Subunit: 346 residues, 4 copies
Amino acid sequence: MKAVQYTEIGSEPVVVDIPTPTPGPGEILLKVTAAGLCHSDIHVMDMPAAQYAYGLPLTLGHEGVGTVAELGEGVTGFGVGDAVAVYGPWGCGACHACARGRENYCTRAADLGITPPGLGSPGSMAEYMIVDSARHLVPIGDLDPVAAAPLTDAGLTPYHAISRVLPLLGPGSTAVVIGVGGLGHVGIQILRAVSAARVIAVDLDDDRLALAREVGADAAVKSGAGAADAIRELTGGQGATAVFDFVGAQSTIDTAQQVVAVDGHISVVGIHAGAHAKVGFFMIPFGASVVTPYWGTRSELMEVVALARAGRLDIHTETFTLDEGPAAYRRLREGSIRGRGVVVPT
Amino acid sequence: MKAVQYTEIGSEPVVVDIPTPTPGPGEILLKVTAAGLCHSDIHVMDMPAAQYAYGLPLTLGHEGVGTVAELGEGVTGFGVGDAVAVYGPWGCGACHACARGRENYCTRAADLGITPPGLGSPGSMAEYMIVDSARHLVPIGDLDPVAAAPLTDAGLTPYHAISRVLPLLGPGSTAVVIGVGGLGHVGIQILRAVSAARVIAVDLDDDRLALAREVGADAAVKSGAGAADAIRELTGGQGATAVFDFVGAQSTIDTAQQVVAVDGHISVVGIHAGAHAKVGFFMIPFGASVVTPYWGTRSELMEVVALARAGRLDIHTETFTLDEGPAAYRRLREGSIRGRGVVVPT
Amino acid sequence: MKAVQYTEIGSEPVVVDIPTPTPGPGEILLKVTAAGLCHSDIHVMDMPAAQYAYGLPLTLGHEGVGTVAELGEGVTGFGVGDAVAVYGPWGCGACHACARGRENYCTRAADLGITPPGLGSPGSMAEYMIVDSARHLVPIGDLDPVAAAPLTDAGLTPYHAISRVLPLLGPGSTAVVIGVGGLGHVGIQILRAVSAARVIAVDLDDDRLALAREVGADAAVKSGAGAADAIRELTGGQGATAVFDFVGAQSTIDTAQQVVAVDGHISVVGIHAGAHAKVGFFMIPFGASVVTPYWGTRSELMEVVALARAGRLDIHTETFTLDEGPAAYRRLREGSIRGRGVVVPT
Amino acid sequence: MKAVQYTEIGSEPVVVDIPTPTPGPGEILLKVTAAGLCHSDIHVMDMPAAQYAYGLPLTLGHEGVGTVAELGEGVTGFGVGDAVAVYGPWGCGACHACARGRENYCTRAADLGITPPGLGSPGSMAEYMIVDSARHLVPIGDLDPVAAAPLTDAGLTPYHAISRVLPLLGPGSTAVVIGVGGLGHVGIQILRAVSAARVIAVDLDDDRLALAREVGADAAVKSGAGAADAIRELTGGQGATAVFDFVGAQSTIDTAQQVVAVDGHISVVGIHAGAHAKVGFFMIPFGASVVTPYWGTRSELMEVVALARAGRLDIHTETFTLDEGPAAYRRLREGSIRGRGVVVPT
Ligand SMILES: NC(=O)c1ccc[n+]([C@@H]2O[C@H](COP(=O)([O-])OP(=O)(O)OC[C@H]3O[C@@H](n4cnc5c(N)ncnc54)[C@H](O)[C@@H]3O)[C@@H](O)[C@H]2O)c1
Ligand SMILES: NC(=O)c1ccc[n+]([C@@H]2O[C@H](COP(=O)([O-])OP(=O)(O)OC[C@H]3O[C@@H](n4cnc5c(N)ncnc54)[C@H](O)[C@@H]3O)[C@@H](O)[C@H]2O)c1
Ligand SMILES: NC(=O)c1ccc[n+]([C@@H]2O[C@H](COP(=O)([O-])OP(=O)(O)OC[C@H]3O[C@@H](n4cnc5c(N)ncnc54)[C@H](O)[C@@H]3O)[C@@H](O)[C@H]2O)c1
Ligand SMILES: NC(=O)c1ccc[n+]([C@@H]2O[C@H](COP(=O)([O-])OP(=O)(O)OC[C@H]3O[C@@H](n4cnc5c(N)ncnc54)[C@H](O)[C@@H]3O)[C@@H](O)[C@H]2O)c1
Ligand SMILES: [Zn+2]
Ligand SMILES: [Zn+2]
Ligand SMILES: [Zn+2]
Ligand SMILES: [Zn+2]
Ligand SMILES: [Zn+2]
Ligand SMILES: [Zn+2]
Ligand SMILES: [Zn+2]
Ligand SMILES: [Zn+2]
């Protein structure tokens, strides 16, 4: 089969021909319909030799959607042909967190050598992929695969971050969304669908501010030095109930701290090495919690899919072939994809 | 192997010799260390011919603990010898409720013919039992099997009922526990371990009131017409924040309605066919929710086990052999078991 | 001043001339801008001699909005002219429930003789009204008084009922709203603003079903014997996560029980003497809680007002003068007001 | 009347004779029965001239308990003689946070010049004190005033910090308490009363570790470089579900970050200027929230009082006279009070 693999350190990913795999007992083989490109796949290929621990070669792609091609022995709940989205953050399935579906917060996955597809196990950027267990498949029915693929991470991750403090986001509340990219443009829509929060979007790019308005933001503010005061102008000096920072650079976190409300929240979702919120007295309002969430839960993915199927999630995508995969990753580096890049095997 | 089966309608269960089963892919074979007798096993054998739909024969026992004897193909997370408790209320594992571990509230288990062990599938009152999936096994480590078996239902069910309204049971709250039997005597202990609620126990039998005091009740009141006013004497006329009725007869539910607080809760856990709370204006206080909960969740079972391992759950038991099983069920009918009856295969 | 009072038992309310009151220490005198007519004002006038305990005469109207006319001694937080909505369900202010703003669930208001305006204290259907305390005034800013008056009950009461089980109403959930009248048409809009629940409206009147679609319902079904099965057709046989029954007759409650989901909720908000949910095993799904909620909380009223100010609550009203008050109550009996009737003193 | 006032900057507080105040409308005059000394009163007197904004003179003491001496006009809910504890963190009473009793998180108290007694308004370290409003009085009944005074802050503050993440602290959870002083020794007891968390105490002083065991800690560990690894030894390498750091120095926060669990919590309750948690990816586990909580809520104070009245809070105290006040503050500087210092006016 055809696939995109990261085959040497510091070199760009290449199109390859590898064995179509077979499912063993418990596993499921999917024909891939769509495979999302995430900014996190860049962090993975930018890792030095000493830091990279996902093994070589590695079939990329942790945002996966497909149709069931073959059942491994003993597997029930799925028939051949069912369209399914792949739950990425695989856990052990047995710990207290995993039993609540919160496999993203699995404590023992590291020690047992369970790694996500695209981040240690063969991923979705291939004609077929293996899924370890039936519990990591989420039905999508007649959902367009191209729009479903980003739901597995670009939808799931903001959905989770928002879900953690959803009780705070009642009528009267204000949610700030920093970074209207893959994640943030879905985050805005989530906030609108599951809350009455006023949504303020923040980005450097005026085109991305326009995108924020397109997908439901009540206001849009240019990022940088002016941002915090412009957000306080909009909030009447009360601050933002929640900041969802999908950029996660120091300047965005600083902004988040300067605007968050007393008893509010900051969710640092974007990843910049070294960047951190400084949570201590006089550096942040009273009661303003900060967290770095990770991916999301099984029940949350199903909820994201239910939003997509209800028409509440317009996911802006561009389609690529497997051959155009390498090129698409380069496009993702330059920031020229207006939403999410998706690969469709022909 | 030796087992206790319900073989004919209306007739008492008998000791039998049946094939030691083999695990297929995904399944786990356990040697049984302990098997609990529940009052619900009586309701099952008292069902008429037309109502009984669990099939014949049926190996009894839905409270199960064991050691892993054999792994079916593809099963990981457990090695031979691990002591495990069996999660009873099996669900489909894939629905929104099941993905949160809430397999007790699985919507699709009925239509798929997934039934608990002891209530449609072979149960624990046998030398060995099959468990369908790894996710239905909960490690107990070095916990005494005899005291662990009741945790799977007698602990789990009250733990769940209490868990649903645990936010209400803060300092200042009062919890009434009606029926200090298998479930209720564990319920009292749970309330003490996980809340600061004042605990008032209610029972007909003065011996069971003594048992309530033994396990942590702050007061004990004889049941009947006088119970409500005696509970109001203790609560200063404010009412009970929560009533956990483990009897569930009409008179106990009536009592529960006459004592529950404004914005409080009634959990009808005991089962008497025809009995019901009457929830309508003027028949119950404002904001006083009522529910009939069912069994409990995967994460809840682990929590109950963690309580047992921490020394917070004194489970009063009497041990029986497989041969004494039939006799132990007659003893459970008369109400002569002070706590929970447990069968240990020799 | 002019007002509408209930002056003798079983007789209709009449227009009267009574002293313009003065605020004592702590109190606030409002000039009334709008005064809502609620179906509950009918139940009050339908009470027999023996049951009626609100005193005579009684200035009607528990849905009140005004402008501050005079401050009683020691009162701060409000200046003359501020437009305010009146929080109706007055409590003692000191108990555990009142300290959380939950004055609707005040335990000690009954024994202290604190009664709502319009239901024991002088109400809003007058040129001026007294409010006991500053904590019972909610700023509305430039909100149209006519549309703000229903927020105090018609908005607040459904907002509360929904707030209690809001965690259940995620994407994928279904909320049924029975009775698309004053309350129910605001309930539908609340569900849309604060949740991603699919909203199914139920009413006897096809015109009210049209009204349900106008205000955002995803479907509408005629009430009666057919309702339950038509709701199950729409939910795929899964049932309704939540039923908010604003009629509260036995037939609507029966419907609610026949459609509610496993681990779902029924909120009996409408009031029919004798009507009740029958909550017991086999009469309702496992885990399906039932409650009769009452009015709502202080923080909830502010939230309802925040929804109105954000444009999320189209409140359908008809305006009346104080002279047309009596007539407007007769019009409310026949069910000819399409939404909520509001009295505006000139 | 006699009182202790901070009268010049950088000078120690002195015993003075000032007018017995009179309550105006809404206010309540209390005869003080007990007045707690908090470490925060030291931070206040250590402030430079430029930073100190509480006005001079200032009657100290923000932990206050008394009996009602006189009612201001219009005040109801309290009769002369009622023993009451004073809710310290006064807010505006009208905002969304204040209406939920969360006056600690009042957004508008700063701009309105509402300041706590002992931190801007006359405090409790005097024969009498004024309380602005009835809502800031909490009945204590026959509770010993000396043991009730610390409940208003030393009890309330840890109760709040714990209350925020109480859902995390189920059976199986571990709570670390760093600093077994005034606050921390009450925090340990709270954790035991309202949760099944395993409690690990951390302190520099072996005497304070002994105190931790006296009041219910399951283990005790010497603070410093070794602390984190010793906590991980106890938790099986899983980490602590929650860290409540009542010291709040950088080294304790660093420790808290090195031991907190994935999806856990750090509550930085102690105050060291400049100290902060560094919440960013790779510097703290996934999902581990951090917050600096402030004081606590009205309903929480009542809950703390209910714990004291139930016998669940052994508050270690030493009594002082008003004359010994100055000396008692010097004793608090050196750290020679084993628990909380309380002043009783003679
Ligand atoms: N927490 C998790 O588990 C998780 C999951 C998936 C992705 N991520 C991370 O989230 C981040 C975002 O992913 P994406 O694919 O949505 O990003 P992206 O590449 O699609 O674009 C990010 C957006 O942020 C904007 N931006 C850049 N710098 C900015 C600044 N200083 N201020 C304001 N806006 C700025 C860009 O204009 C763009 O609109 C990445 O760092 C990624 O690694 C985290
Ligand atoms: N909700 C669920 O999923 C679930 C799970 C397990 C059991 N159950 C049900 O819970 C009930 C209790 O189970 P158990 O095993 O503790 O029962 P048990 O027979 O072991 O003990 C019953 C106790 O209730 C007392 N009692 C009887 N009548 C009473 C009255 N009028 N007032 C007060 N007390 C009275 C008895 O004296 C005894 O102490 C059973 O009826 C069973 O069907 C429900
Ligand atoms: N819980 C509380 O504190 C509280 C507060 C306010 C009002 N209420 C109660 O709520 C109820 C409704 O109040 P309202 O003023 O909104 O009513 P309304 O008179 O304004 O509207 C009634 C609506 O219910 C519909 N209806 C009547 N019978 C029906 C049936 N069998 N099936 C379906 N729909 C039916 C009517 O067609 C109409 O659309 C009243 O009984 C009132 O007393 C309760
Ligand atoms: N959040 C709020 O509003 C609020 C309210 C009251 C107090 N506080 C703050 O809480 C803090 C604690 O108050 P307290 O009155 O309990 O203090 P205290 O002086 O009574 O107790 C200090 C305790 O911490 C221990 N300690 C000191 N350094 C340590 C280290 N490196 N590692 C471990 N333990 C150490 C000491 O041995 C002692 O047991 C203060 O800094 C105070 O300002 C905050
Ligand atoms: Zn990703
Ligand atoms: Zn796990
Ligand atoms: Zn049972
Ligand atoms: Zn299921
Ligand atoms: Zn009303
Ligand atoms: Zn009250
Ligand atoms: Zn203090
Ligand atoms: Zn406030």
